[PDB]
Write an enzyme that holds these catalytic residues in place. Sequence first.
Site, PDB file in Angstrom:
ATOM      1  N   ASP A 162       7.498  -4.161   9.791  1.00  0.00           N
ATOM      2  CA  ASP A 162       8.273  -3.685   8.646  1.00  0.00           C
ATOM      3  C   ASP A 162       9.729  -4.113   8.841  1.00  0.00           C
ATOM      4  O   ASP A 162      10.124  -4.391   9.947  1.00  0.00           O
ATOM      5  CB  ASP A 162       8.139  -2.168   8.620  1.00  0.00           C
ATOM      6  CG  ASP A 162       9.089  -1.514   7.667  1.00  0.00           C
ATOM      7  OD1 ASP A 162       8.962  -1.798   6.451  1.00  0.00           O
ATOM      8  OD2 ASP A 162       9.955  -0.685   8.080  1.00  0.00           O
ATOM      9  N   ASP A 211      12.868  -2.479   6.933  1.00  0.00           N
ATOM     10  CA  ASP A 211      13.890  -1.448   6.853  1.00  0.00           C
ATOM     11  C   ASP A 211      13.661  -0.269   7.790  1.00  0.00           C
ATOM     12  O   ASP A 211      12.614   0.334   7.785  1.00  0.00           O
ATOM     13  CB  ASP A 211      14.044  -0.989   5.429  1.00  0.00           C
ATOM     14  CG  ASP A 211      14.344  -2.143   4.506  1.00  0.00           C
ATOM     15  OD1 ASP A 211      15.369  -2.805   4.725  1.00  0.00           O
ATOM     16  OD2 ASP A 211      13.573  -2.444   3.558  1.00  0.00           O
ATOM     17  N   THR A 224       7.261  -6.384   3.870  1.00  0.00           N
ATOM     18  CA  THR A 224       8.149  -5.424   3.277  1.00  0.00           C
ATOM     19  C   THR A 224       7.666  -4.918   1.917  1.00  0.00           C
ATOM     20  O   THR A 224       7.032  -5.645   1.133  1.00  0.00           O
ATOM     21  CB  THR A 224       9.577  -6.032   3.182  1.00  0.00           C
ATOM     22  OG1 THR A 224      10.479  -5.066   2.664  1.00  0.00           O
ATOM     23  CG2 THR A 224       9.650  -7.223   2.212  1.00  0.00           C
ATOM     24  N   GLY A 225       7.997  -3.666   1.637  1.00  0.00           N
ATOM     25  CA  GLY A 225       7.772  -3.059   0.342  1.00  0.00           C
ATOM     26  C   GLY A 225       8.944  -3.174  -0.615  1.00  0.00           C
ATOM     27  O   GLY A 225       8.901  -2.615  -1.720  1.00  0.00           O
ATOM     28  N   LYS A 227       0.203  -4.282   1.628  1.00  0.00           N
ATOM     29  CA  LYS A 227       0.514  -4.417   3.053  1.00  0.00           C
ATOM     30  C   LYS A 227      -0.751  -4.555   3.881  1.00  0.00           C
ATOM     31  O   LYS A 227      -0.864  -5.474   4.682  1.00  0.00           O
ATOM     32  CB  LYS A 227       1.329  -3.214   3.517  1.00  0.00           C
ATOM     33  CG  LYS A 227       1.734  -3.252   4.968  1.00  0.00           C
ATOM     34  CD  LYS A 227       3.009  -2.415   5.229  1.00  0.00           C
ATOM     35  CE  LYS A 227       2.763  -0.929   4.958  1.00  0.00           C
ATOM     36  NZ  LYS A 227       4.010  -0.183   4.626  1.00  0.00           N
TER      37      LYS A 227
HETATM   38  N1  LIG Z   1      15.211   1.842   1.979  1.00  0.00           N
HETATM   39  C1  LIG Z   1      14.828   2.860   1.175  1.00  0.00           C
HETATM   40  N2  LIG Z   1      13.586   2.896   0.630  1.00  0.00           N
HETATM   41  C2  LIG Z   1      13.157   3.897  -0.165  1.00  0.00           C
HETATM   42  N3  LIG Z   1      13.941   4.961  -0.460  1.00  0.00           N
HETATM   43  C3  LIG Z   1      15.279   5.017   0.061  1.00  0.00           C
HETATM   44  C4  LIG Z   1      15.783   3.971   0.914  1.00  0.00           C
HETATM   45  N4  LIG Z   1      17.041   4.348   1.214  1.00  0.00           N
HETATM   46  C5  LIG Z   1      17.271   5.548   0.582  1.00  0.00           C
HETATM   47  N5  LIG Z   1      16.199   5.955  -0.155  1.00  0.00           N
HETATM   48  C6  LIG Z   1      15.932   7.202  -0.979  1.00  0.00           C
HETATM   49  O1  LIG Z   1      16.929   7.812  -1.834  1.00  0.00           O
HETATM   50  C7  LIG Z   1      17.141   9.206  -1.445  1.00  0.00           C
HETATM   51  C8  LIG Z   1      16.819  10.223  -2.521  1.00  0.00           C
HETATM   52  O2  LIG Z   1      16.870  11.528  -1.944  1.00  0.00           O
HETATM   53  C9  LIG Z   1      16.256   9.546  -0.254  1.00  0.00           C
HETATM   54  O3  LIG Z   1      17.021  10.011   0.860  1.00  0.00           O
HETATM   55  C10 LIG Z   1      15.538   8.275   0.035  1.00  0.00           C
HETATM   56  O4  LIG Z   1      16.039   7.862   1.254  1.00  0.00           O
HETATM   57 MG   LIG Z   2      10.784   0.931   7.091  1.00  0.00          MG
END
Ligand SMILES: Nc1ncnc2c1ncn2[C@@H]1O[C@@H](CO)[C@H](O)[C@@H]1O
Ligand SMILES: [Mg+2]
EC number: 3.1.3.2
Lengths: 210, 209, 210, 209
Positions: free
Chosen positions: A42, A44, A110-111, A150
Site C-alpha cells: 500500500d 498511504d 493504491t486505492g 486490490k
Molecule cells: N488518505 C486518506 N484516505 C481516506 N480518508 C482520509 C485520508 N486522509 C484523511 N482522510 C479522512 O478524512 C477525515 C474525516 O474525519 C478522517 O480523519 C479520514 O482520515
Molecule cells: Mg494506507
Amino acid sequence: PSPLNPGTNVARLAEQAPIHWVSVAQIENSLAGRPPMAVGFDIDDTVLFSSPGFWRGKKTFSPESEDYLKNPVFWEKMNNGWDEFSIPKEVARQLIDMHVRRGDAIFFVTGRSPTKTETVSKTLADNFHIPATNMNPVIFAGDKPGQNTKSQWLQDKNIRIFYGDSDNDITAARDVGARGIRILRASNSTYKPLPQAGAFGEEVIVNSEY
Amino acid sequence: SPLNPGTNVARLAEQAPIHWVSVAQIENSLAGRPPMAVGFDIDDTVLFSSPGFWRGKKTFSPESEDYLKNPVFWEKMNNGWDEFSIPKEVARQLIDMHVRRGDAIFFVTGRSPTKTETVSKTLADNFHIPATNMNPVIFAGDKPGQNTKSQWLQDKNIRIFYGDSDNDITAARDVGARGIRILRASNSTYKPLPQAGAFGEEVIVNSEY
Amino acid sequence: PSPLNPGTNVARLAEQAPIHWVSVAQIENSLAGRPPMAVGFDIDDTVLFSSPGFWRGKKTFSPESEDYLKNPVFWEKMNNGWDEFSIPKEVARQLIDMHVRRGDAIFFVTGRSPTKTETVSKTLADNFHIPATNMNPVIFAGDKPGQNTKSQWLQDKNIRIFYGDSDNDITAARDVGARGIRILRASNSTYKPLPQAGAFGEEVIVNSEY
Amino acid sequence: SPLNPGTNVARLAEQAPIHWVSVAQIENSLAGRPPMAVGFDIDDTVLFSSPGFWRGKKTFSPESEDYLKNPVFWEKMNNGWDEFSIPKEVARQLIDMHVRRGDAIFFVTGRSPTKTETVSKTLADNFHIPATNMNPVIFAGDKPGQNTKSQWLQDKNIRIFYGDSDNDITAARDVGARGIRILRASNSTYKPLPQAGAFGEEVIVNSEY
Ligand SMILES: Nc1ncnc2c1ncn2[C@@H]1O[C@@H](CO)[C@H](O)[C@@H]1O
Ligand SMILES: [Mg+2]
Ligand SMILES: Nc1ncnc2c1ncn2[C@@H]1O[C@@H](CO)[C@H](O)[C@@H]1O
Ligand SMILES: Nc1ncnc2c1ncn2[C@@H]1O[C@@H](CO)[C@H](O)[C@@H]1O
Ligand SMILES: Nc1ncnc2c1ncn2[C@@H]1O[C@@H](CO)[C@H](O)[C@@H]1O
Ligand SMILES: [Mg+2]
Ligand SMILES: [Mg+2]
Ligand SMILES: [Mg+2]
C-alpha cells in the site's frame, strides 16, 4: 472525562497486547532461501506519510465536508506533485531495501483515484532507490469501471506478501492467501481513527510509524 | 543488532524520570491567575511542518543543510508551504485553554524573517485564535551558539513557553519563565529527536500529535 | 455553397480589403525616440497557438458541448502544462524581441479561467527569451470574484499598446485610450469563427497568423 | 527588407500556375467509378500534429532535428501525443467523401514504426471512419535519398494519394497513382513549407485547415 491525576500501577505500565511483532530482519530471515517473488505495498501511511497533501486537499476542496476524496481536481494535484511534501517512511526504506536484496518484484497498489498522468511511481522509485528491474508502475485498484480490485491485482501479479496499514490491506491479502503484514499508521496522520494493528492475528512491524 | 533481541519486564515497565503533565493539569496549576502572555514555538510544537522542510531540503540543498540558511527557501516556507503543515492536537488544546483564560498568545519561531509572511494568518485561522489574543509571529532566526528566543520572551513578558527543542526550554529558563516541552513526532525530518525532560522541565503527555 | 467551377476575374483577384496593415518594423519606427513604456499581449492566438490543448480539452470533457471551458480539470491541465504543446507565434517572437530592444515592460493579460498555480508565465519567458526585468507574471483578468477586468488592468499597469487577436482585445485597448493592434488568428485555430481583423479601423500586423 | 516595401497591382493579382481543385471537383471526377483504395499522409495532411513534434524537439533534441530519428520520441508520438493533434477540415471532407463512395482508406506516414501505436485508433475515431473502410496505419519511415512510400502505394493498389510533401506526390507519380496536394499550415513547425504544385499536380484549395 479524564480525572485530573489518574495515576497508574506497574501491572498497567508493563501491560502488553498479545500481538505478533516482527522486525524487517525477522521477515527477511523467514524468507531465507526463497527465490525471487512478487510482493506489494500500500502507499498511504505504509510507505509515504501523505497526510500533508490530504490535509491541504481537505482544506482546499471541502473545508466543511469530506467530498475532497471524490474531487477529480484534488486527485490531479495529489497524484502529480503533492507527494513532494509526503515524507517517506523509514520502515518502507528498510522493507524495500530488503526486497531488492532478495531480487523480488515490487508492486505498489493504491486505492487512490486514478489520473491519466501520475508522478507517484517516479517519486517512489527515486526516494526509495528502486532499480528498474524491481520497480513496477503504481497500480490504482478499486471498483470503478475499468478497474480490478486490490485482491484481484494481488492474484494477477502473484503477490505473496502485502504490506499495509489499513484493515482492508490485511484482509485483501487474507482473501487471496497472501501474507498480510501490518505497518503502524502514524498518530499524526489525518486519516482517523487509527486502525487496530494486529486485530487479525497478523504480523505487525515494530516501530513502523515512521 | 540481534535478530531476536528479546526483552524483560524491568525494561517493559521502565520509566524515564520525567515530570509528565496533561493540559488539564497545566490549566489547574493556573487557576485564579489573571491573564498573561504565553508563547509557543511553531515547528513540531504547534505545526508538523516537516512537509515543507523536506520539500525545501530536496529542492534547495539535497546534499547538505544549507537550505536552513537560504532566504529563497524561507520565502517559500513562510508564504505558502505551511498549507501542507499539519496542526497538532496538543496545540489546539493548549491554545484553546489559554484563549479561554484570556491570555495573550505569541509565537516565537527559529525560522528566519522574510519580506512577507502568511504564517501568522495560517496559525490564527487553523487554531481559531481570536484577534485580541493573536499576535504576529516573531521570527527569531537561528544562530549557532546563541539562544535567539530568550530576548523575545523578555520583550513580550512571556510567562510560559511551549516548545519541542532544548533551546525553547532554555530560553524559558534564561528569563525565569515556565518552559513546557512538547514531544517532537517520530516522523519529523528534524532528527535526532530531542530528549524531552533533559532540563527537568514539565513534558506534556501524548503531545506528538 | 459554390458552383462546381466558380471561376473568377481579375478585379476579384486584385481586390483588397481597406485595412491598415503594419509590420513589426513600422511599429518600432512609430515608437522611435519614445522611452520605455508598458505594453501588453493577449496569450491565445496572439503569442501562443494553444488550440492543441483546447482541442484536447473539448474532445475529453465535452465532445457534444462547450462545457469544457467551465471544467476545472481542463483548466488545471491547460494552465499547468498543456502549453508545452502550444506553438509559439513568430509574430510574437518578433514583437517581444522588438519591445525588449526598446526596454519596455511586457505584460500578458489572459481571460483563461484562473487556477491556483500556473506554469504559463514560465513557458512564455522561456520560449520568447524574455529577460527578468521585462517579464511580468501572467495576469488572469475577468469577472470572477476577486478579479479585475482586462481594461482595468491595462489602466492599472499604464499599458500603452495592447496586442491581440479578438475584438475584445482591441476594444479593451480603445476603452482606456491604449493603441490596440491586431494579430491574425490562425485559420486552423479551433476558436471559431475567426474575428474580422481591422473592423475597428485598427492596425493589423501582416503575416501574423503564424 | 524595406521599412516600406510597397506593392503594385501586378503583384496583387499575380497567380502561381497551379492546378487548383476542390473536394467537389475531385468527387465529380470519380462519379460512377467503383470502390478503390485511396491513401492519405497523416502529418499536415489529415492532422495538424506539430504540437507533439514541437514537444518532442524540446524534450529530445532542442538544437537539432535529431529527435526525428529517436525511437523514444516515436514511442511518445505514436501512443498518445496525437490527443493534441488537430484534425484538418479538408481531411474530414475528403474522408467523408471517400467513405461515401465505398473506398478503402489507407494512411501512409513518414513516421517511424514503434512497438505499439494508437494512431490508427485516433484517426478512425476523429474522422468517423467505419470499420470496413479503415486500414491500420502504415508507418513507412523516412530515409535520406529514398521514397519510402512509393512501394506501399503499389503494394496496397492505392489509386489516389493525398499529402502535403513532395514525397507524397512523387510516390504517387512513381506508381502511376493520382497524387493530390494538401497545403501545409503556415504555423506547422515543419519548415520550410513545401511548394505545392511543384510537380504539376492538383492542389486542393483552402486545404491548410
Ligand atoms: N488518505 C486518506 N484516505 C481516506 N480518508 C482520509 C485520508 N486522509 C484523511 N482522510 C479522512 O478524512 C477525515 C474525516 O474525519 C478522517 O480523519 C479520514 O482520515
Ligand atoms: Mg494506507
Ligand atoms: N531538519 C531541520 N533542521 C533544523 N531546523 C528544522 C528542520 N526541520 C524544520 N526545522 C525548523 O527550522 C528551524 C528554523 O530555525 C527550526 O529549528 C525548526 O525546528
Ligand atoms: N477553442 C476556444 N474556444 C473558446 N475560447 C477559447 C478557445 N481557445 C482559447 N479560448 C480563449 O482563451 C481563454 C482566454 O480568454 C478564454 O477561455 C477564451 O475562451
Ligand atoms: N514538424 C515535423 N518535422 C518533421 N517531420 C514531421 C513533423 N511533423 C510530422 N512529421 C513526420 O515525421 C517525419 C518522419 O520522417 C516526416 O517528415 C513527417 O512529416
Ligand atoms: Mg520547534
Ligand atoms: Mg486571443
Ligand atoms: Mg505530411
